Amino acid sequence: ELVAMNETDPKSIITRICDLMSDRKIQGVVFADDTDQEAIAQILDFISA
Amino acid sequence: KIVNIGAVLSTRKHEQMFREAVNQANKRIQLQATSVTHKPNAIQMALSVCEDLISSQVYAILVSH
Numbered sequence: 001e002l003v004a005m006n007e008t009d010p011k012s013i014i015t016r017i018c019d020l021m022s023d024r025k026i027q028g029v030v031f032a033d034d035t036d037q038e039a040i041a042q043i044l045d046f047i048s049a
Numbered sequence: 050k051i052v053n054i055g056a057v058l059s060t061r062k063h064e065q066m067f068r069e070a071v072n073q074a075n076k077r078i079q080l081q082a083t084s085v086t087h088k089p090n091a092i093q094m095a096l097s098v099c100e101d102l103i104s105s106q107v108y109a110i111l112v113s114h
Contacts, residue, residue: 011096011099014092014096047092047095
C-alpha cells in the first residue's frame, strides 16, 4: 500500500525511502513514474544497488 | 560580483585556509565560500549535498577523500 505524489525530487524519494524504513516493513519496492527519466535509474544504481 | 564556491574537506583548519585563499584571490570580481565538510557517510553527505546546493550561487565544488 502507498499513495502517489506528483514530485520528481529524488531527495524527496530518498526521504520517502527512509519513511518506508520507518514503516519498518519494507524490504523491496516495485515502483515507477510517468516520465522518461533515466537519471532516477542512475540514482537507483547509486543508492538502492 | 560575488560567487559562492563549495568544497569537501576533512578538517576545518583546511576550511579556514580555503576561505583565506578565497580572500587572497579576492584581490582581483568577488568570491564567496560556503560551508564544507566530509564524513565517511554515503547517505547523509549526499543528503546534505542539496542542503548546501539550496543556495543558487555555488558554481564549482571540490572533493577530497
